[PDB]
Amino acid sequence: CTAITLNGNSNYFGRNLDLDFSYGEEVIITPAEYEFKFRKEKAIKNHKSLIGVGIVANDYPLYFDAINEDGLGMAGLNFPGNAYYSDALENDKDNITPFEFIPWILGQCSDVNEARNLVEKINLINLSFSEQLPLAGLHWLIADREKSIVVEVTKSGVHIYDNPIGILTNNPEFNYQMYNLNKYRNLSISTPQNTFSDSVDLKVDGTGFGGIGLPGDVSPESRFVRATFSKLNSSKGMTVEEDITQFFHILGTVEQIKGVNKTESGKEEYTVYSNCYDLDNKTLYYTTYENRQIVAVTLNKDKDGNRLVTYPFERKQIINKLN
Amino acid sequence: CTAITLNGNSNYFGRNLDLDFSYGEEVIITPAEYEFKFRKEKAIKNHKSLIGVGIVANDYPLYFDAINEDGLGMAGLNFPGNAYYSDALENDKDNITPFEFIPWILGQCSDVNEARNLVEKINLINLSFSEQLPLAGLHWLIADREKSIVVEVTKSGVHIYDNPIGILTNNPEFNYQMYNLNKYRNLSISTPQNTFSDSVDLKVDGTGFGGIGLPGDVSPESRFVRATFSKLNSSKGMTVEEDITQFFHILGTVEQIKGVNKTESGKEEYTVYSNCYDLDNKTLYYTTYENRQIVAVTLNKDKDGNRLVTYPFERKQIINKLNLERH
């Protein structure tokens, strides 16, 4: 997985979902008055309305990622081994399951400051959704229009990091991911000077020599570095459309194609979908592995009602045939 | 630039065009009876029909890349400094300009073997199209459904290489690009075993460790290696449509986004367009930097037309909007 933010004409947030199969994920809109029930806390009957991507099981929206009506985003990314969920409930904490974590935060908080304050009081508890959908290790990027934070709950406790670059992938932990960037300081967007030695006439026969050293594989660390370099140096767009276009190009730099990353089961890991949320305009844009054309759906300020509203992903290549 | 081939349910050929501006590119169909004029040779009034991408200037199709009615393709890629075009005309060879080279080959040749025999005997001459559109050094990938060759005309002469992998970018010369792959034999699609040392317990905390060492920058050598690794290992598709989808994913691994590659002029080099020709079905599919939706145009047999048929590129993001906003 790779999740990024982007600040331009509007403000954006989104992710690649990398996996060896599709869950049958879809757009899910949770209306303000859909009752959020929690396994160990009091139900929230009236909350901020959400739009996001995930599956519906037992009439409950299991979000992979989502934004709310205030333009606060949240995405769960794989964090295998490092994620620790506690078996013990705490009287002085809000005892919340990892699958309830997106509704808990996005239902109640309008920005990152309010998200941080609420995450500070949390205890992520080890209870699965069902026997069919057991818990997996996750960590979270939470982002609004100004900034973002990373939430990683491990054996040592609940860690919240300011994310200065708006990038997140998978393992290792976030301080290791940020430290890993330091050795790439010498990378450049331009042709560098010959600092190797002035006593040899080193020739440049092509553009893009500045980037030499940037890792190209699809391991989580290499994708963290490549996404950071691509995002931070990406050119500013003139419009919101140019920003969204540029956003999908940035996610395309760390996309996983079928064939290059075979898992232990022998299945091919690939970028199942890519999405971009316009946070100021409350609009989800997305693409799938099977369809390059961007699909858009706006969360409109309507008192929607009671029930989950879904728009299924269409996994067929929509080609404009000119004949 | 990166040009690749792919063999799946059908057989494919295509490229990324990497540049710091757009020429106003368009689909150009040249019918069989469009008279190809040549600066230093006799005009050809009847030939094979082409479909490809480029610009029209003075009613002449200036192809960036194209295919013909037999599914033979040809693409010109940037080859700065290494290309040598002759300043002298030969009395016993066809004196053809670089901008005439795609029509010269694709107009007359049905497969790679015929293209090679014609390329062997050519004299590429140092003549510009016009003052507005001067020559720049190129090298070519020529591909059919079976195989592909690389043409590099340098000071040492006309060099034709069998391309065993169906990959081409820019400098260096092709033997250097192919030799450069040898150091990456250790790369893998799966989590490798700890051969570093069994005296230390090295942990794997994520997928994709096998690829570590694959270069990720947009220099021509790094794109040559990354495109080769991505193309050769890419999964087989069930249908032709899945192959095309997969083809655009392969070109996307070596795409240049605006901002990461600042040229000498200070402008940003970017993938202006990507295309995929279905060679068996003679159909051009393409995308642009500004538009993610694939656009398709088929070459139809039309043995009597003598005028170029053109479809300009849409440089606007065509989004499938499910509902309207309230602004």
Ligand SMILES: C[C@H](CCC(=O)NCC(=O)O)[C@H]1CC[C@H]2[C@@H]3[C@H](O)C[C@@H]4C[C@H](O)CC[C@]4(C)[C@H]3C[C@H](O)[C@]12C
């Ligand atoms: C060749 C065409 C003119 C004929 C034509 O329009 N053919 C395509 C068609 O008919 O669709 C012209 C029109 C605009 C020109 C471009 C613009 O002036 C901008 C820019 C100016 C530079 O001096 C040289 C490169 C170029 C991209 C120009 C190259 C070329 O000089 C262009 C692209």
Ligand SMILES: C[C@H](CCC(=O)NCC(=O)O)[C@H]1CC[C@H]2[C@@H]3[C@H](O)C[C@@H]4C[C@H](O)CC[C@]4(C)[C@H]3C[C@H](O)[C@]12C
């Ligand atoms: C993307 C590169 C850019 C090459 C360049 O100018 N490099 C200078 C450099 O790197 O120093 C190539 C690929 C196909 C080329 C075009 C095609 O061959 C068709 C046509 C051929 C004419 O001889 C010159 C103009 C042009 C439009 C060419 C302009 C330009 O030549 C193109 C678009």
Ligand SMILES: C[C@H](CCC(=O)O)[C@H]1CC[C@H]2[C@@H]3[C@H](O)C[C@@H]4C[C@H](O)CC[C@]4(C)[C@H]3C[C@H](O)[C@]12C
């Ligand atoms: C597996 C996948 C990505 C990581 C990877 O490559 O393993 C992760 C990221 C978000 C996850 C899903 C979301 O967190 C929503 C659900 C949460 C439930 O606790 C498990 C099922 C559930 C439906 C998850 C399945 C799976 O673990 C997802 C889809």
